[PDB]
Amino acid sequence: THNQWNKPSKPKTNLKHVAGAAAAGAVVGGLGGYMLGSAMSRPMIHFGNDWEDRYYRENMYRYPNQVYYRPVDQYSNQNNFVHDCVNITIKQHTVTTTTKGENFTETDVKMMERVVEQMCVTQYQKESQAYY
Amino acid sequence: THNQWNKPSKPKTNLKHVAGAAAAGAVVGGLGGYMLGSAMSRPMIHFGNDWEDRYYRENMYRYPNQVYYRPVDQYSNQNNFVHDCVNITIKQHTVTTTTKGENFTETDVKMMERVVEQMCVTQYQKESQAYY
Amino acid sequence: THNQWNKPSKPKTNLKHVAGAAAAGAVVGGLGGYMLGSAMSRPMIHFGNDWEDRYYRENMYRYPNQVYYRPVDQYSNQNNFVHDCVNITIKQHTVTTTTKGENFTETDVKMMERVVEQMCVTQYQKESQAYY
């Protein structure tokens, strides 16, 4: 006789963001930036009744991977990448307070002429010759 | 006779961000940046009843990986990368307070002429020759 | 007779950020930056009942990894990388207070002419010749 009696009370099980290869917010590029043979995930959760006998499972597995970066004649002049050019600030600030003033003049002058030429300029070639 | 009796009360099980290869927010590049044969994760959780007998499982596993970086004729002139050009500040600041003033003049002057030529400039070649 | 009786009360089990290869926020590049044969993780948690007999499992494993960096004719002129050019500040600052003042003049002059030429400039070649 085999008797299995199961009564789990208010279980909570949460799986979030389970993947073989996870690249949710990845930024990839640049002549073969990311190479991956294979990726596998197998989370297992057991909290019931389990009874097994005389079985034969999951035998003789092979996972052969070859990941080759093997170009023959590769010429790259400019290869670049940047993530962020962030929080760049230029200001002229004045705060003036006069609780009480009788006979006065206030002058506030601000000039910005040629403050910057290049601020966030990543890749360029100027007056340059390349021969192949 | 076999008896399995299971009554787990209010269990909480949380799996989050389980992957074989995790590159969620990765930045990758640059002529074969990231090379991975294989990546595997098998997290296992057991808090029930488990009973097993006369079994034969998970035998004879092979995980052969070859990761070769073998380019033959590779010419790279400029290869670069930067994460962030962040929090760059230029300012001219004045705070002025007068609580009481009779017969006075105030003059605030601020100039910015040519403060910066290049602020965040990553890769460039100027008046340069390359021969191949 | 086999009796298994299981009554775990309010267990909490948390797995977060479990991976074979973890590169969540990595920055990678540069002509074969990161090379890895294989990476595996198998975390296991047991707090139930577990009864096993006469079994044969997980035998005869092989994990052969070859990770070869072997370019034949590699020419790299400029290879570079920077993380951050952060928190760069140039400022001219004045705080003035006069609680009480009768007969006075205040002048405040700020100039920035040519403060910086290159602030965060990583890679460049200027008036340079390369022969191959």
* CA-to-CA dists, residue A107 to B44, B104, C117, angstroms: 74, 12, 31
What are the angstrom distances between the C-alpha of A105 and each of A49, B45, B104, C103, C106?
89, 78, 7, 12, 11
**Cβ contact, residue pair A83, C48, below 8 Å:** no
Please tell me the distance from the alpha carbon of residue C29 to that of residue C26, in angstroms, as a whole number. 10
Can you give B78-101 as a three-state secondary structure string? EECCEEEEEEEEEEEEEEEEEEEE
Please provide the DSSP assignment of B19-36 as one string: EEEE-TT-EE-SSS-EEE
Chain B residues within 8 A of C45 when measuring between CB atoms: 44-47
Q: How far apart are the first and last CA of chain A?
A: 83
Contacts with A41 from chain C: Cβ below 8 Å = 20
State the smallest CA–CA distance between residue A84 and chain C in angstroms: 10
Closest residue in chain C to residue B13, using alpha carbons only: C13
Q: What is the resolution of this structure in A?
A: 2.7
Three-class secondary structure of residue A20 per DSSP: strand
Is residue A21 within a helix (H) or strand (E), and if so which, with residue range? strand A12-22
Classify residue B9 by its DSSP letter.
B
Annotate C21-51 with three-state secondary structure: EECCCCEECCCCCEEEEEEEECCEEECCEEE
Note the maximum CA span of chain B: 108
| Integer Cα distance of B25 and B36 in angstroms | 17
Q: How far apart are CA A27 and CA C18, in angstroms?
A: 22
CB B80 within 8 A of CB C80: yes
Distances (CA, A) of B86 to A42, A87, B25, B91: 40, 5, 18, 16
Q: Using CA atoms, how far apart are residues B117 and B121, in angstroms rounded to an integer?
A: 10
Chain C hits for A83, Cβ within 8 Å: 27
Are residues B68 and C36 in contact, defined by beta-carbon separation less than 8 angstroms? no
Q: Which residues of C touch B13 (CB under 8 A)?
A: 13
In DSSP terms, A108 is beta-bridged to B108
d(CA C67, CA B66): 6
Cite the DSSP H helix spans in chain A: none
A-B Cβ pairs (cutoff 8 Å, strict): 497
Q: Do B125 and A46 touch (CB under 8 A)?
A: no
If we measure between CA atoms, which residue out of A59, A103, C9 comes closest to residue B12? C9
Annotate B83-116 with b (16+ C-beta within 10 A) or e (fewer).
Answer: bbbbebebbbbbebebeebeebebebbbbbebbb
